[PDB]
Write a protein that binds this ligand. Structure first.
Ligand code: HEC
Length: 104
């Protein structure tokens, strides 16, 4: 719950292939705008994978955590293989930033 350390983990983790900035520009990957609430593979832009287009679950706070600790195992098929998170606060914090970052 530290948008501060959450941002740090973001600039070095997700900023790589993301934007998480409203009215931004999805680069080397889709955006996470108003993510918390939309169904998997629902963002119009990047060619989402069938697994994400399967619409099995919806992005949320906790859902993102399990997804942040194993993005692949959560929705097998999703195009994203880099590195999951280690500690919980890393996910919560990281998610705290993804919230205020995808809200602005
Ligand atoms: C490039 C090596 C990536 C890094 C680093 C991160 N992500 Fe990513 N992410 C990437 C791709 C190519 C995709 C598309 C996969 C697909 O099925 O279309 C994604 C997707 C996501 C999503 C899902 C989008 C949605 O369904 O709304 C999320 C929530 C996401 N990525 C989060 C995320 C976070 C928090 C990262 C930093 C820890 C991160 N990604 C890094 C590619 C890459």
């Amino acid at each position: 719950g530290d948008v501060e350390k959450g941002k740090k983990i973001f600039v070095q983790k997700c900023a790589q292939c993301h934007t998480v900035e409203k009215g931004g520009k999805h680069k080397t990957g889709p955006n996470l705008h108003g993510l918390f609430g939309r169904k998997t593979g629902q963002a119009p832009g990047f060619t989402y994978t069938d697994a994400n287009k399967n619409k099995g679950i919806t992005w949320k706070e906790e859902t993102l955590m399990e997804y942040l600790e194993n993005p692949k195992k959560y929705i097998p098929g999703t195009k994203m293989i880099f590195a999951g998170i280690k500690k919980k606060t890393e996910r919560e914090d990281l998610i705290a930033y993804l919230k205020k970052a995808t809200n602005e």
